[PDB]
Paper text:
The toxin also processes its precursor antitoxin RNA into smaller repeats and subsequently assembles with the individual repeats to form an inactive TA complex. Here, we have chosen to characterize a type III TA system from E. coli ToxIN cluster 1 (strain 680, assembly GCA_001893605.1) in laboratory strains of E. coli such as DH5α.
Crystals were obtained in several conditions; however, crystals obtained under a specific condition in P1 211 space group diffracted to the highest resolution of 2.097 Å at a synchrotron X-ray source. The asymmetric unit contained two hexameric assemblies of TA complexes consisting of six ToxNEc and six ToxIEc repeats. The heterohexamer is a cyclic assembly of three proteins bound to three RNA arranged alternately in a head to tail manner. The endoribonuclease toxin ToxNEc is a well-structured protein consisting of five α-helices and seven β-strands. β-strands form the core of the protein that is supported by α-helices on the outside. ToxIEc forms an H-type pseudoknot consisting of two stems (S1 & S2) and two loops (L1 & L2). The residues Lys33, Thr52, Ser53, and Lys55 are found at the catalytically active site of ToxN, and the residues Trp57, Phe88, Tyr110 and Gln117 hold the RNA in place for ToxN to cleave the precursor ToxI.
Author numbering:
A (entry chain E), B (entry chain A), C (entry chain C): 0 to 162
The structure:
Amino acid sequence: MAKFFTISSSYIKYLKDFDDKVPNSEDPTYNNPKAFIGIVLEIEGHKYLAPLTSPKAWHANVKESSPAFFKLHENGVPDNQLGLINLKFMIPIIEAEVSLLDLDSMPDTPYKRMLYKQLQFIRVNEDKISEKSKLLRNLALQGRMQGTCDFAVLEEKYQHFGK
Amino acid sequence: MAKFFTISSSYIKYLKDFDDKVPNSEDPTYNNPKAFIGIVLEIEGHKYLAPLTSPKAWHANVKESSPAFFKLHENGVPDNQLGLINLKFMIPIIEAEVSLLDLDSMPDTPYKRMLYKQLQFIRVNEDKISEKSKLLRNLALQGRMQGTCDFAVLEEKYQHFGK
Amino acid sequence: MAKFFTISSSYIKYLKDFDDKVPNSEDPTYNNPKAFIGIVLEIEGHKYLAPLTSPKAWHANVKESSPAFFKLHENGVPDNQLGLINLKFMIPIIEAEVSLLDLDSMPDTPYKRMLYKQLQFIRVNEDKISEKSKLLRNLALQGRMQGTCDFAVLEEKYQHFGK
RNA sequence: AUUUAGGUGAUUUGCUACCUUUAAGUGCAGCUAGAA
RNA sequence: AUUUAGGUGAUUUGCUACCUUUAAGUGCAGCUAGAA
RNA sequence: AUUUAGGUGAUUUGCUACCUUUAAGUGCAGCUAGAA
């Protein structure tokens, strides 16, 4: 619970073949790799990682009640917005295709300090994040969320990676 | 719980014959009929409605611990005092002799807006109001309350109205 | 629980024969006898009383997590420090050798006013004090606390007092 | 309309919390700055 | 009188919370304003 | 990257709380100062 991961580009491409909403893993504008938080949900043998995303203007219109997102901010400093967990684009993973961020070897950077500020807030809210993940998947499967990842198709296809 | 009612004048007079502390229900001074809130208590098959009453000076001396009263005020605006529920003068009712207020059809008036501000506070505290009503009846029957309605005689006599 | 006691000087000196850290009980400079609070711990048939002690400079360096002490202050007035319960020098007692303070009949003095402020703060924290007492004894017996009373020796020896 | 129930603190002014003789003194404020 | 137990955070300055080597990082403040 | 799920209030503007059609309206703010 509450660990940062990166995901192999080839696994991302494999999943993208079946669902184009799977998060982008390559972009020349990315300063660091796409970080995921996990494991946000473990259900029916599937382990899910959810992508982190930096602030965007439309994040202002996100209601806390939406399980598609978990808004992040510094513990006790709500004005210090730290992006959000984009649960609506979480994906099931093969453990061979994911790797923990090597925080204790990464050099001291503004990004690493932000990662730790995010981590404290996530750890304190782990149960809320898992509840939102479970609810979001459940509603999306029933067609009661719009434009999330295709959890049925991803759960049907992901284990055929490399096979 | 937390609904506004009016009570037939004949039922009120019937009960008043057995207990003169039964609330006055009609008066030319009334801008609106005497409103009751209910059902505040259901015990031994008897359903109780409690009268609302507008501010009086002596209400300032009412302590929260007294189950004879439930002071009302606007949610989050304690200085906007809205009278009280006079639990000590609650009465058991016959369903045929009471009527819901027709809120969804009543014309919009300042009185109706006040009713809604009262209703919100009552809804939020419905459990407390019910606890106070039960406690008040229990203490009054043991003779440990001051000048309440005579719940024993009222429960003995009320069902024989019209029979 | 949460009662003030004095302990007979002979019992104190008897225990001091086996453990020199047992609190000094009389000193010509003392305005009042050394007051104890109890019963803070009841374990394996032993009843424990803990000495109260007035402020010392080093009390500023005491951390709340230490079960060796329970700092006292006026309820809701943290700046009004009232010394501490020195649990690390608590002792098992023989009931015949302890006496309640005569709070009912003692004349009103500033010391008695302070005693009552201490009593309120202790009463509100009774469970916390008992937890600290049990933990401190447990850790001291394992050598995980420093310079407390010798609870093993005191519990072995206290009952042969007077025989 | 019907004009404040009694209690819970070795102590308790106001409000509050709590209890309903089948069971309960918490929190805030005020005052207090005592001594081991 | 007797003059600070050690820990719990992939990170943690103060205090607090939590745990008692079988375990456990909460909250406030401080600093931080990073980027997918 | 991927640009707000729908509901819960005899009433409900924003946010929040709550519920996941098996169920659910709390809190803050705004407005209101009504009368038995």
